[PDB]
Design a binder for this molecule. Structure first.
Ligand code: NI
Ligand code: NI
Ligand code: NI
Ligand code: NI
Ligand code: NI
Ligand code: NI
Lengths: 101, 566, 100, 566, 566, 100
């Protein structure tokens, strides 16, 4: 007996089902580490991350909600992105959109 | 992409089909539904979801909630569901999916600049408890009940005076006025009971007009048919409830005589099993009746190997009996009965008893309503197995049946279910957050009207809030004018119409009771059974349709020595 | 520890009994609050050990005698009452005429 | 039919001719009268008298009391009587016989639906104590005094500041206003003393107009004849009292010079024996005068084997003297004198000293006014035997003489006897309920204005209120707006006329002092002796009509080690 | 005639040229000036100066102070001076020479009948501390900070909720209104910070209009350039301050990107060293900028042998990292750096960091702002010797440099220096009295708005206030309506103009912030250094003009084990 | 003594640990609050002795074993945290997985 223990049903959960996705190669050209959270507007990340910003427009990382991807200086990764939903309106970040898209 | 269900449960709390053990009991809940969109859960923190332009939007305060409890596992009479909970203007705004409509799908709880976050992933969230058998013996009972997860206290008294030590009565306009004033200082919602025992209705109408939401008929003030009839007549006129502690002595009649005096009118029978008071040996038969809302008090919950020794002596001490007088011993033996104490647990399991309560410091423990309700559910699963209503390999229906006993059923009985008693839209945001290992015993956060009112708290001078010693400390929801905004004082319709709140300069928010007379046994959520119950005058055996109703006493209980320092 | 108010209140009782225990060990005749604290704390420990309520109602009568307490103290204490968490939850122990 | 007197006393408390020992002292009271009709006593509980149509009637709230203390053994300056006490609208309604006029004879205290019950059978009930030498060093002194049975505190100060550590002075309109505001938070009635030491009367009139009910002349602010004269002139104009701590140093004159400056005007002499302050060695001679109301402070009460060692050092510590300077030692020896400390106890026994008080945290113990008054009475019975006024085989007159010292005589001295100081009809219901074994040391219930304000209370979560640990906890009469309704802030006539209560938004009930100038030694209840007293300048011996007044120091006292944990 | 300087110092406290050790540190202050006239010092007590016609005059209340602190040794940013301090109407009236103009020369602080006395001879008196990094996790933090000598608390939160555990944010009009109401109950001046992270300015203007005096940008709510820009735009419109906890993750840009987003606008950078949060590894470079007011939080103050082990684990626990994930370990190692923690102490010593603060219960100790500031000064004297600004054989300039960090510089940063932050005429009388042996650790008296609010206090029932146990107990300045009169709730200009105080029925005195945008690094008293600072991306070494800035970790500190029971 | 609130709060922790110490000496399996109190007080004494934070993070894992505590108690205590005054001021000690 363990107080408050879970008996999780074994299996898997599919995330962001039915949503458009794309893959982009990213490289940290900066000299300091960069970590990006699941819901950040990927096209507006730190300018030291080099990738196809046009392809990334209106996308975020396709990872579990609340998690993040880390890029050490010089690190390269191909990341998977998922399109924003709802109204598809972007406000904040580096102030590059500030409206629909 | 995919995530394993174990990793998902670790990150966001359990989802559909996962099971959780309630504290150290044998009770297991199963998540029935989950209102999220997988991948779009909101979590707060560094690099997390609830951040500007992400899970937090651009909306003005009028367009978002003031508080979101993220990833809560709700346990309520209506379901065991995973959801975000939104609170706005001190009330439950929605149960659903929180976030930002600008970038997320299916958002029903908008999060903005004006939104605070409570992280409920991995926690169980319930409504605040409602204890309707309070003796206002001392004000320290309020923090004691609040820490246990009880947010509303209905009862009577004036402090540590003989009348209050024995009865839940606040006698007369003067004491009623003083207690409504004192109530503003306590971090729980309060409604008062007046002294119901009189045969002149105007002496009752005056008390209701002064502020009481109900009248208590107690045998120590004469629980006669004429007094009961008078109190019910006034209750029917003024939309307030009558609570009853009947004539144990059978002085004025037997239980059938009190039932005839009630004459099918609505009444709340306190400690229906009878150890706490009532026609000896058969007050328990009141639970057969459609107009009776029956509660138990807690020292007899559940039946244990120390119950009888403890109670026989507890009664001898309270009543100054002395084991040497045969008639005092005959009285004590007619009131404390293993037959009815054992049957009571089964009657709760069957839904024939509808409420639990304390009887605070008057044959009852104010901090133990919730944990003893769960101890009964545990003992009943152990002895009886699955309820007939149970679907699936879980105890969900038994859990819903029992949580209703200290939440929605006391609220319906006392005409306050429009304000409190459940997690439902428009109700006051009285919520309790529990870590599953401490469910029912030691809550993580107790919320009053949208503000945290009490919670465990570690060293004040520490670098973080978690270092020792961790003990319950009152929070901002329990301070001065914030407390007043976040609690309710319940008044009768007559007191509200007469401007009692303004006259007494009551500072707290006011609510008015209604529906005290229309409520019946059939309205008790998951606990509407009207058994054909009998009690043998000689042996005290309880039978339903001639079948013996009994149980075995526990040697060891969960929610006990693993948790408490003393 | 998540100590509730009632758990913290029992710490006060435990401490008062430590005062009395040290004084009884010095051979002093205990006074009224010392005697109440000493017997009450003894009962709480018996409940923690898993003793029955019936057993402790009797054991509590053998903690202090009239020779171990000041004049009038037995008459000042017609009973001692205390609750504690037994293996089967909180229970009340009343020790009648504990000091003779 | 008949009942034995032993069985009667066990059931209802003692009756006429029965005697009761006060705590563990050698003092015995005898019941002088009993206002009941035998067989018609009211008792509350199961099957008891106070029930509908029985001892409880059908009357409306305006026609019955709010609270009845049943079968009380009253100990007050006017009698030691058995009676029921009725309280209504926060005031003493009647002392007499309670019940229902519909079925019972001789009822003077009607009990109805609106009546709460306090069971006083087997208890002693007294008025609340009145301590008029409070230094407002810290607010924690209020609960300390209230627990001891003191319901009114008159004094001065602003907190733990040098001026307040030394003197009972709240200097100036600003601090007076802040302290009257702070007073609303404390569960005791309060009146403030201003700084009396000035020779410009307008600087005194401003303080009285701001709210003070008296002015303290203290030697640390210059207790000169001109300052004393100015304060008395203002007092005579404004109907407020002057409290005096005279010129110990004899700097401005000797005791006769201060007496000439007073010029027969009314004045309260604090710590008249002089260890607490005053003309060395002969301030005690002030008790001969008709215009002087003399009080003692408590560390010299009664004289014990540890008194001198304790005081000589206590004075050395307070004044930073150091045993090495001969003049500092000469000062200390001129102030602390076994001759006057021993005489003081006898002067109390003879009624030459009229009041007791603390001098709280400034050479005085705030929780010990009552128990030390009784210790003096005990030590005086032991050494002197019966008082000349004593009738019967009891100590009733000595008991009445001593209780008046901390109840009615401080109230008369400070012009508040119309509101407090005794159990008399129309006075505020400040009452203390005592179990005889704990009389004077640890009360059972302390009532403020009709509500229980503090009482011993057991485990909050227990099934009954009596399990351990039992300790004093504030009750509903000490909470927020109920506390405000149940306490008084005393103001001067000038402050009341100037609308000080409204200007400062004082929340508590207000009372106004009157009769501070007309009161004289001859008005001190049972303590009007004006002895022809002298003090020898060389030996310090106190004589009355040339007869040596002295006593022996106690080795052991009652009301001490049997009761206290430390 | 003459008195020796040793005897003078014993009687009146030190004078010009005398030195005093600060607690058990190696820091020594030297009295720079003394405002008395030798022979005319005022002292209170028996036979002392402050008596009618002597050091106390005949003036009316309007013509004298309400309170005088006699013979204080003032330690403030402007001087280390011996003087009397006069307080009147809750404000500092004058710093000078107290007494009676009728008989004494050079009197600038008139003492009359209406004047209370605090004896400050032999004590050090300072302004009350101002902590601007409070997380309102629990209300118990107020007494904790007040006892430490902090009288103003600026921060954000709603209680023990995830958002508040992480950030100093009170989100939205509803919680802002509830917290301003709760603030009336606490004996400290309070100003609130709202949630600054949004890109819609109206969601910020609504929070300022509801009452917040500033906006906190925290990375947990998204510390992006757009959110920072929005908050600064609103701050410039509404005269409120912006506090920043920057993007540690470098998610939106590196430190230069955040600096560009700030665009030379005024901002308070919290925990500028970065262990508490911010661009890794180089947020410390913000102290070079003229528009940045940089504070440290306290667990990194000073650098000790247990700092790193403690912090690396403290961060792992707060963020739920687990030492098994290399990226979580890489994150933790990028945030906790011995190079910046060691440089921070030197940057404080040079005046490049301008404020100290707690970060209460969120990587910071609420009772330790003052003692850790002094521990840094001590460690810096030990390692660096005299500051370049130092004149004389004393540490006076270093002392002035450091006291400004928790007094005047936080007040200037948050636009409240017109009310608090220093001992200056017209400012609220928030004062702390220290015995030199306990300077910085355990104050003797804490004064709020002219009333003592908390102080050590001995046994309540003792004959004097000094017997054991002595512990901090709230005084009259912390009670109900007196507390309201003696504290301030700070509001924005918009909230004050909109009648927020009247709408919420706030009871305390109100102050309005101003000058939040005009304040710059050059205005930080004694701490205006703008170094050309760099941080190496690979090694984390801090350099100023290419010179390595570092220090050594302490094994033992003063103001530690000699003083605390645990 | 001039005890601050935080010093008085640590007295409460010390007292709760005395309760647990006496029960462990009787051979009882300790419960949740007893176990937290016992290990936390042990750490405060180690800080008073001048032990390092690193040393106490390790020493705190050897105070109680799974055999000395009730079922489920080790799982109820994933860590114990307490601060105390070290020779170099207040520090936080977190003992990870203290009972195995
Ligand atoms: Ni009952
Ligand atoms: Ni009851
Ligand atoms: Ni005096
Ligand atoms: Ni005095
Ligand atoms: Ni931060
Ligand atoms: Ni912070």
């Amino acid at each position: 007996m363990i107080p408050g223990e879970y008996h999780v049903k074994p299996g898997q959960i599919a995330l962001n089902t039915g949503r458009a996705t794309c893959r982009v190669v990213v490289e940290n050209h900066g000299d300091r580490p960069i970590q990006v959270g699941s819901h950040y507007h990927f096209a507006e990340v730190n300018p030291a991350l080099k990738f196809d910003r046009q392809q990334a427009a209106g996308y975020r990382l396709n990872i579990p909600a609340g998690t993040a991807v880390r890029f050490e200086p010089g690190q390269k990764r191909e990341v998977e992105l998922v399109a924003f939903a709802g109204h598809r309106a972007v406000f904040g970040f580096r102030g590059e959109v500030m409206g629909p898209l | 992409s995919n995530i394993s269900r174990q990793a998902y449960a670790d990150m966001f709390g359990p989802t559909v089909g996962d099971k959780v053990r309630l504290a150290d009991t044998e009770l297991w809940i199963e998540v029935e539904d989950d209102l999220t969109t997988y991948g779009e859960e909101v979590k707060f923190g560094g690099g997390k979801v609830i951040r500007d332009g992400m899970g937090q939007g651009q909306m003005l305060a009028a367009d978002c909630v003031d508080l979101v409890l993220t990833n809560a596992l709700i346990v309520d009479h209506w379901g065991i569901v995973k959801a975000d909970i939104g609170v706005k203007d001190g009330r439950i705004f929605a149960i659903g999916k929180a976030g930002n409509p600008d970038i997320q799908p299916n958002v029903t709880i908008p999060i903005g600049a004006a939104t605070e976050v409570i992280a409920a992933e991995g926690k169980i969230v319930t409504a605040g408890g409602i204890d309707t058998h309070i003796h206002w013996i001392c004000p320290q009972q309020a923090e004691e009940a609040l820490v246990s997860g009880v947010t509303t206290m209905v009862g009577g008294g004036t402090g540590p005076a003989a009348g209050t030590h024995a009865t839940t009565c606040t006698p007369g306009p003067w004491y009623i006025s003083r207690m409504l004033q004192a109530a503003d200082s306590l971090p729980v919602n309060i409604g008062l009971l007046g002294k119901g025992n009189v045969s002149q209705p105007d002496a009752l109408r005056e008390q209701v007009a002064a502020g009481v939401i109900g009248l208590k008929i107690h045998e120590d003030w004469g629980a006669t048919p004429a007094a009961i009839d008078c109190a019910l007549t006034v209750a029917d006129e003024m939309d307030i409830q009558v609570a009853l502690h009947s004539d144990t002595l059978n002085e004025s009649g037997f239980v059938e005589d009190t039932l005839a005096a009630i004459g099918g009118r609505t009444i709340h029978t306190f400690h229906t099993e009878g150890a706490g008071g009532g026609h000896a040996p058969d007050i328990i038969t009141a639970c057969a009746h459609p107009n009776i809302l029956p509660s138990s008090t807690n020292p007899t919950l559940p039946y244990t190997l120390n119950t009888i020794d403890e109670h026989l002596d507890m009664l001898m001490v309270c009543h100054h009996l002395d084991p040497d007088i045969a008639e005092d011993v005959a009285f004590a033996e007619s009131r404390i009965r293993r037959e009815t104490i054992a049957a009571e647990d089964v009657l709760h399991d069957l839904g024939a008893f509808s409420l639990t309560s304390s009887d605070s410091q008057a044959m009852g423990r104010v901090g133990e309503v919730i944990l003893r309700t769960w101890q009964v559910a545990h003992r009943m699963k152990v002895q009886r197995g699955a309820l007939a209503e149970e679907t699936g390999d879980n105890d969900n229906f038994r859990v819903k049946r029992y949580i209703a006993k200290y939440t929605i059923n006391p609220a319906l009985t006392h005409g306050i279910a429009h304000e409190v008693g459940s997690i439902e839209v428009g109700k006051l945001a009285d919520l309790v957050v529990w870590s599953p290992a401490f469910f029912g015993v030691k809550p993580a956060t107790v919320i009053k009207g949208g503000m945290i009112a009490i919670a465990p708290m570690g060293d004040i001078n520490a670098s973080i809030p978690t270092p020792q010693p961790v003990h319950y400390r009152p929070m901002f929801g329990a301070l001065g004018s914030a407390r007043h905004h976040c609690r309710l004082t319940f008044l009768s319709q007559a007191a509200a119409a007469n401007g009692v709140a303004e006259r007494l300069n009551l500072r707290s928010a006011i609510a008015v009771v209604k529906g005290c007379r229309t409520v019946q046994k059939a309205d008790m959520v998951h606990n509407s059974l009207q058994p054909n119950i009998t009690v043998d005058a000689q042996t005290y055996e309880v039978r339903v349709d001639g079948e013996l109703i009994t149980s075995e006493p526990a040697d060891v209980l969960p929610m006990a020595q693993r948790y408490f320092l003393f | 520890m998540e100590l509730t108010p009632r758990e913290k209140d029992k710490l006060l009782l435990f401490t008062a009994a430590l005062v009395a225990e040290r004084r009884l060990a010095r051979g002093l005749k205990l006074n009224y609050p010392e005697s109440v604290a000493l017997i009450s704390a003894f009962i709480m420990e018996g409940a923690r050990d898993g003793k029955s309520v019936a057993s402790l109602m009797e054991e509590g009568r053998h903690v202090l005698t009239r020779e171990q307490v000041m004049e009038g103290v037995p008459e000042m204490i017609p009973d001692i009452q205390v609750e504690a968490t037994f293996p089967d939850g909180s229970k009340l122990v009343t020790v009648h005429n504990p000091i003779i």
